[PDB]
């Protein structure tokens, strides 16, 4: 009952402007199907579509519980719904995957690398997945990657899809108040409406009043993701939760979303992938032939202009304007990372998390031993010119020893840390009476020895 009393929704009560089609209004619905305020004159009413979705067909039977929320709501009210009503802990990582709304197909082992590589990173960090909701394009690759692993939904995979309410097929079938509404994995090819992804877990249906049109979720998702980043993480050392942005393909619009993330306080690192095409491939080709970031010569500039006007089929002035936004992204070339095939996107996502953390390197090392990932440490935490505090490497070595991390001990031996200077009587004693690690039979033997001693 708290869902209906706290969150709102809006319905299309307009003057029905015809524009193109006589049946299609400004909101695109049928003329007799009715029942922002500019040209739509919408009214505010309490929500009538919340509860749980039972997915019939489409593989495994899975429940993805949902709520229809007005697009102008404050994200503070929504975060209380995740934490209290939906019993979700605060994530240790937020990732937000964007891309093209059009369906596409990539390389088959690019689909394998994206398959295992994402869902391993979500498992090791306990992360939240933020997609576009509907089962088109990049999100169709997301749910297919969830078909690869599935399994531990109890380990908080949490693929929350944020989609507009207007384009999800069978809207009247999904009307209920805390009631299990059965939903089909049938998607009609004749209908322009597209269905939700079948293997999600939570849904933020954002109604702006209109139907069949996008843009009802972009402003809500950006304000929500900022709102999570202001929440202090459970380590409570002075940092919020990390946020990274995963980019595959995309159109000319997603380039502006990159500049929105980069020109932001705090800055959000992005990661791109190669081989999908379109906006991801032009951002990749910008990165390798870049020199000093925005310092791009004329011949490579014209090669970028002709590839924009060919792949995105734009004009000369539209390609030049997209090149301006690409140069504005180029200024912050350090924040972006590029994944190239030929190894997974685990290392790319976690490297971008390291770059966007901007914390102390002993804290990065402690996060690395928590992650059990050695290669991330050897390629990022031992950076060229990394400041090392006096004794912090010794504490990291001690934690690696008591945590049973043999490869990390190999790393700290490889990068300094004299074994003679490390040892102290109290150090060996405090690593002799540690409880973290495997099962210890030393207690019983030391009890028997102290008993037989006297």
């Amino acid at each position: 009952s708290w869902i209906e009393r706290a969150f709102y929704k809006r319905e299309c009560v307009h003057i029905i402007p015809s524009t193109k089609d006589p049946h299609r209004c400004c909101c695109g619905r049928l003329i007799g199907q009715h029942v922002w305020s500019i040209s739509k004159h919408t009214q505010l009413s309490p929500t009538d579509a919340f509860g749980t979705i039972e997915f019939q067909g489409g593989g495994h039977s899975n429940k993805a519980m949902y709520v229809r929320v007005s697009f102008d709501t404050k994200p503070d009210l929504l975060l209380h719904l995740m934490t209290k009503e939906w019993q979700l802990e605060l994530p240790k990582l937020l990732i937000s995957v964007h891309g093209g709304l059009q369906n596409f197909e990539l390389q088959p082992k690019l689909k394998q690398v994206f398959g295992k590589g994402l869902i391993k990173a979500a498992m090791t960090t306990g992360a939240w997945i933020f997609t576009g909701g509907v089962n088109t394009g990049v999100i169709r690759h997301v749910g297919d990657a969830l078909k690869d692993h599935a399994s531990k939904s109890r380990g908080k995979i949490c693929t929350i899809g944020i989609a507009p309410w207007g384009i999800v097929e069978n809207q009247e079938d999904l009307i209920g108040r805390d009631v299990v509404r059965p939903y089909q994995t049938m998607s009609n090819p004749m209908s322009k409406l597209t269905v939700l992804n079948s293997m999600h877990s939570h849904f933020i249906l954002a109604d702006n009043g209109t139907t069949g049109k996008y843009g009802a979720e972009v402003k809500l998702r950006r304000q929500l993701e900022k709102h999570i980043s202001l929440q202090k993480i459970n380590t409570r050392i002075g940092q919020g939760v990390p946020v990274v942005a995963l980019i595959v393909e995309g159109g000319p619009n997603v380039i502006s979303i990159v500049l929105e993330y980069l020109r932001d306080t705090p800055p959000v690192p992005v990661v791109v992938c190669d081989g999908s095409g379109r906006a991801s491939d032009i951002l990749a080709f910008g990165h390798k032939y870049s020199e000093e970031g925005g310092l791009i010569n004329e011949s490579l500039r014209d090669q970028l202009l002709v590839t924009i006007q060919k792949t995105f089929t734009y004009t000369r002035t539209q390609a030049q304007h997209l090149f301006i936004i690409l140069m504005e992204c180029m200024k912050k070339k350090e924040l972006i990372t590029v994944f190239r095939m030929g190894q997974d996107i685990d290392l790319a996502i976690l490297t971008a998390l390291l770059k966007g953390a901007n914390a102390s390197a002993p804290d990065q090392l402690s996060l690395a031993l928590a992650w059990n990932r050695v290669d991330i440490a050897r390629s990022q935490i031992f950076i060229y010119g990394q400041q090392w505090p006096v004794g912090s490497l010794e504490q990291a070595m001690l934690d690696a020893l008591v945590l049973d991390r043999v490869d990390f001990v190999k790393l700290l031996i490889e990068n300094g840390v004299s074994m003679h200077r490390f040892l102290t009587i109290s150090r060996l004693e405090e690593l002799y009476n540690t409880r973290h690690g495997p099962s210890n039979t030393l207690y019983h033997l030391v009890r028997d020895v102290k008993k037989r001693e006297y």
């Binding site: 390389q107 088959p108 082992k109 030929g342």
Partner: peptide, 30 residues
């Protein structure tokens, strides 16, 4: 190695098809 060989031969044969299209378009114009 035959897993990456098969993937790259799928890409190389597609690129050879694009090579055939480009060569036919070049030969048509001259």
């Amino acid at each position: 190695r035959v897993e990456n060989m098969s993937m790259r031969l799928e890409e190389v044969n597609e690129r050879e098809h694009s090579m055939k299209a480009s060569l036919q378009t070049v030969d048509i114009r001259l």
